[PDB]
C-alpha cells in the first residue's frame with residue numbers, strides 16, 4: 001500500500017475538501033495521513049480502513065486529537081462492501097492503485113455523494129478528466145458527473161513509492177443530469193458503440209451504426225465531420241442519445 005507522505009499533497013486535498021459542505025467519508029484511511037487533517041475541518045467524518053489492526057490504531061489517534069468523548073467514526077471495512085448513505089456527503093481517498101476502477105465504478109453507481117476527491121494513478125486520472133480528449137468511460141458517465149484534474153502527484157510523494165506517478169481527481173455529481181438515470185444502460189451502450197465503431201471520423205462512424213442519424217445532424221450540432229469520438233462534449237453525447245433514442 002502507498003501511504004501519502006507528502007504534506008503539501010495533504011494540504012492541497014484538505015484545501016479542496018474545505019470548499020465543500022456536509023459530512024465526509026474517507027476511503028483507505030490508513031494511519032490517518034488525511035484523516036487527522038480532515039477531522040480539524042470540524043465536520044462529521046467517517047474513516048474507512050480494511051486493515052482492522054490499523055483501523056483500531058487510527059481510532060485511538062483520531063480520539064486523542066478529537067475534542068473528547070462528548071466524533072469521527074473509524075470503520076474497519078472493505079469500501080467495496082460499505083453502504084454509502086443516500087443523504088448528501090463528500091468522498092475523499094488515496095486509492096489502492098489495483099482497486100481504482102472497481103472503487104470508481106462502486107462510487108459512480110452509488111448514492112448521496114456530491115463531490116469525490118481521489119488520489120489514483122496519473123494515467124487513469126488523466127483519462128477520467130478527459131485530458132487530450134475523452135475516453136469511452138468518461139463519456140459514459142458525463143450525463144451525471146463532471147471530472148477535474150486538480151494536480152499531478154509524483155510517486156516520490158508516497159511511502160513506499162508506487163511504480164507510476166499519481167493524479168488528484170475531483171468528481172462532482174450534476175444537480176441536473178443531462179440524461180435520465182433510467183436510460184443509463186442504453187446511453188452507455190451507445191457511447192460504447194460510437195467509440196468502438198468502424199469508420200474514420202464521426203460522419204463515417206454514425207453512418208455504419210444501427211438506427212442512423214439525419215445527414216444534417218453532425219454539422220447542426222457543431223461537430224466537424226472529421227472529428228473523433230474523444231472530441232465530443234457532454235452536451236453533444238446527450239444530444240446524440242436523444243436523437244438515436
Ligand SMILES: C[S@@+](CC[C@H](N)C(=O)[O-])C[C@H]1O[C@@H](n2cnc3c(N)ncnc32)[C@H](O)[C@@H]1O
Pocket residue numbers: 001002003004005027028029030031032033034048049050051077078079080094095096097099
Ligand atoms: C493506498 S492507501 C492510503 C492510506 C492513507 N489514507 C494515506 O493516504 O496514507 C489505501 C488504504 O486503504 C486500505 N485498503 C485497501 N483496500 C481497502 C478497501 N477496499 N476499503 C478500505 N480500505 C482499503 C489499505 O490498508 C490502505 O491503508
